[PDB]
């Protein structure tokens, strides 16, 4: 799924997400749209053969593991391709890991593109 600006912010606002760690719900749109496009299938590779995987690109070698790199520690303690569904609930459940662990900073779409921005526009004019 592509999600719109919109349904994210809704979907992420159910999970959670709006407020975690001290991080409103336009971080986090503004991040995934950055970081995937809304798109629930990205996927990346990387020059250490790492791969980030789903709707907010989480890498596999610290936070997955798809069998395919090194070398990972799999501390959201999940397949990568369980972040590659539909339903956001995983990568939304492995994301509050993450910065439980630097805050944003560990989404370098984020800080290069979203941070010092007004991120509440991003979920202005939606039903929440
Ligand atoms: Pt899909
Ligand atoms: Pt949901
Ligand atoms: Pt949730
Ligand atoms: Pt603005
Ligand atoms: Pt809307």
């Not at 994210?8 to 997400?17: E, N, T, V, Y």
């Not at 629930?40 to 069998?67: E, H, K, P």
């Not at 520690?73 to 972040?83: F, G, M, V």
């Not at 569904?85 to 662990?101: G, H, M, P, R």
Request: hydrophobic fraction near 35%; charged fraction near 20%; glycine fraction near 8%.
């Amino acid at each position: 799924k592509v999600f719109g600006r919109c349904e994210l912010a809704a979907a992420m606002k159910r999970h959670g997400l709006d407020n975690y760690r001290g991080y409103s719900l336009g971080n986090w749109v503004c991040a995934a749209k950055f970081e995937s496009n809304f798109n629930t299938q990205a996927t990346n590779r990387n020059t250490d053969g790492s791969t980030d995987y789903g709707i907010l690109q989480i890498n596999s070698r610290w936070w997955c593991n798809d069998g395919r790199t090194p070398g990972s520690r799999n501390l959201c303690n999940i397949p990568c391709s369980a972040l590659l569904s539909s339903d956001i609930t995983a990568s939304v459940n492995c994301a509050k890991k993450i910065v439980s662990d630097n805050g944003m900073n560990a989404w370098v779409a984020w800080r290069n593109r979203c941070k010092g921005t007004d991120v509440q526009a991003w979920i202005r004019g939606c039903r929440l």
